Design a protein around this ligand. Structure first.
Ligand SMILES: NC(=[NH2+])c1ccc(CNC(=O)[C@@H]2CCCN2C(=O)[C@H](N)Cc2ccccc2)cc1
Ligand code: NA
Ligand code: NA
Lengths: 11, 28, 251
């Protein structure tokens, strides 16, 4: 239910 | 920190939030 | 938060969301205490009865938020964790005694109108303000009811309760590292923290210097907002020597 966060924070 | 606990949009501007007075009134 | 209201913008600029990377979901609240250190409840990170044992790479911290679910572009900041420190005497086996943990961020966060640290109490501020009847404020994105979830950060003001009333409300063993807060059944008003608010701050505004101090951490309770039950909070001042030792040794 959360908006996806920028991919840079998951790298 | 030296500036801890002073909110930019409230204390730093001398503005009060809508319910902080309830806290103050309890400190008796 | 049960029976609270929507926070104002910038009302709680120390509020932190602990966020699971995969699957992407809220884990807990937390608070910002400097540009590199976040304070939370140990049970947010380690609770073996529920198979919970999060490591640094599992998690992110989101700071400056208002909306629960939206990515708040140009406002929130998302930080990675360098290291988690759990109190060495955190009692997950029995009663959550010493329910406190610190997280060091990989890089310092820039303060802004929406991002600013809370103070930790000194002995005198704690003695003056941690008195029955004196009210603090709890914030979080947790459940709106025991048995759903808010669009934006919620806030509720709650009175500290006399220790014998806290003790007489539960069968769980209470310790000096905890306090309880909430209204009594006869007092009419109500409100409580709840699941999902774990780890967030219980704050008080000092009338001496007009600064906000974090006196407690949302820790435990039986249900949410039940008559005759109270929320239990980790007593931050009682554990401050450990906080200072960690930050001095590892900061
Ligand atoms: N104020 C509240 N009503 C409230 C209630 C719950 C929470 C979140 N905390 C929890 O859910 C914690 C984690 C382990 C079990 N637990 C609880 O709060 C348990 N319901 C009671 C309990 C069990 C074992 C030890 C201590 C307390 C946070 C706030
Ligand atoms: Na009891
Ligand atoms: Na209650």
């Amino acid at each position: 239910d959360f908006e996806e966060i920028p991919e840079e924070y998951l790298q | 920190e030296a500036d801890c606990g002073l909110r930019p949009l409230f204390e730093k501007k001398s503005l009060e939030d809508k319910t902080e007075r309830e806290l103050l009134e309890s400190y008796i | 938060i049960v029976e609270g209201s929507d926070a104002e913008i910038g009302m709680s600029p120390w509020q932190v969301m602990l966020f699971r990377k995969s699957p992407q979901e809220l884990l807990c609240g937390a608070s910002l205490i400097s540009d590199r250190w976040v304070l939370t409840a140990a049970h947010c990170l380690l609770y073996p009865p529920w198979d919970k044992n999060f490591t640094e790479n599992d998690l992110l911290v989101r700071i400056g938020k208002h909306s629960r679910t939206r990515y708040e572009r140009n406002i929130e900041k998302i930080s990675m964790l360098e290291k988690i420190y759990i109190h060495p005497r955190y009692n997950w086996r029995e009663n959550l005694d010493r329910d406190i943990a610190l997280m060091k961020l990989k890089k310092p966060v820039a303060f802004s109108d929406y991002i600013h640290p809370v103070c930790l109490p000194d002995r005198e501020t704690a003695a003056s303000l941690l008195q029955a009847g004196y009210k603090g404020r709890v914030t979080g994105w947790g459940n709106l009811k025991e048995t759903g979830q808010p669009s934006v950060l919620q806030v509720v003001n709650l009175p500290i309760v006399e220790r014998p009333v806290c003790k007489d409300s539960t069968r769980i063993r209470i310790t000096d590292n905890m306090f309880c807060a909430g209204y009594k059944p006869d007092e009419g008003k109500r409100g409580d923290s709840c699941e999902g608010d774990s780890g967030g701050p219980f704050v008080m505004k000092s009338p001496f210097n007009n600064r906000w101090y974090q006196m407690g951490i949302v820790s435990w309770g039986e249900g949410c907002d039940r008559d005759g039950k109270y929320g239990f909070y980790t007593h931050v001042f009682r554990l401050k020597k450990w906080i200072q030792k960690v930050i001095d040794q590892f900061g």
